[PDB]
Symmetry: C2
Subunit: 219 residues, 2 copies
């Protein structure tokens, strides 16, 4: 299991640091950033993220995921197309710079487009009186936070398979606040007391390391 990162930016460096313990390959055109990348844990391949052969060297084939963040949206698209020539199944997460380009990146085969300025402009509009929402968002997204957001899979044969929210009583049982459940394409926020859990559902919750290790055991 391993992750490939295409491009080196403030976003990808923060990504790399949030992926401590994990084996990672960074592919980028600028040799300058080797020790930055090495010292930062991961492995470095010097090359062009838009060149199939350079993606192959970076071990795109068979990767857990590929994260793409090139200098411009047009470059990002070219790299995606490149990864798709190599591996039709590997998960691609691409960063979009401009709103008009999001669908272009998914069209090229990105499974997910993260738009930092969308998120940021939305937080700006929410911070006109106080910083509580941004505070929330920034914090639950950090693995090093005390209370953080986590995804927990309901495996096949869990005590919760076919069990409603009300009965699982997860918050009281575990302390983890359930914010959502991911099931195939969709996210159900605020699962109603009615909701029946299924194997393969992803439980999105917020809790201390303590409450999380607990939920896993309940689960």
């Amino acid at each position: 299991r391993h992750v490939v990162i295409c491009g080196w930016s403030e976003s990808t460096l923060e990504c790399l640091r949030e992926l401590r313990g994990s084996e990672v390959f960074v592919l980028a055109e600028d040799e300058n950033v080797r020790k930055k990348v090495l010292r930062s844990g991961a492995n470095f391949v010097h090359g062009d993220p838009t060149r199939v052969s350079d993606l192959e060297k970076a071990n795109v084939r068979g990767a857990r995921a590929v994260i793409v963040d090139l200098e411009s949206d047009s470059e990002t698209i070219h790299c995606i197309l490149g990864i798709r020539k190599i591996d039709e199944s590997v998960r691609i997460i691409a960063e979009a710079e401009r709103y008009e380009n999001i669908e272009q990146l998914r069209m090229a085969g990105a499974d997910q487009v993260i738009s930092p300025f969308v998120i940021s402009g939305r937080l700006m509009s929410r911070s006109i009186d106080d910083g509580y929402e941004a505070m929330f968002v920034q914090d639950v997204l950090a693995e090093e936070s005390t209370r953080r957001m986590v995804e927990v899979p309901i495996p096949e044969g869990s005590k919760l398979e076919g069990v409603s929210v009300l009965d699982a009583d997860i918050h009281d049982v575990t302390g983890v606040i359930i914010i959502g459940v991911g099931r195939g394409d969709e996210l159900i926020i605020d699962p109603p007391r009615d909701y029946s859990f299924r194997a393969g559902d992803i439980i999105l919750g917020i809790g201390k390391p303590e409450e999380i290790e607990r939920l896993k055991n309940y689960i």
Copy 2:
């Protein structure tokens, strides 16, 4: 009051989309963005966000907040120091693109710094197997959304002043999930059942608009 935005970027443009109906002034040096700024519904002010006279004419004094997003680290700082010469209390929210400048912006007097690449990089590391967390983050922030995050202040004289989270029972009474309570410089995420609501607290909840309305009702003050 009105909000002022210094600079024009993909972030401020999305911010305008979310400040509809609110009165907004954008002050920016690139006259080429004037057309985009007005179509988005802001008043455009051509000028230099690091110059007090241009900040004043963009109505910084007494604004509800000023959003700063400039490409230069040094211009952001100067813009913040210029805002502070005009108005010492106005809320200033500044965008950082490098970690390394977040403390300079604070030292300069920004009340809040938003760093898009911190949030982006964390979502990237969170999306390695699936996109549910990103789906959560951008959904809840969208003000044009089906269930979204909101902040609701606890007003002076609230039915809930001095009431426990447990007694309050906001989720089942209103449907709003309480994610946190903001009090002073602190966010209390998932407040314990022994936590006692005080006036001035800000409730962070997720819910449908009809549910937010009930919460607004559940917390209004009783005064003639």
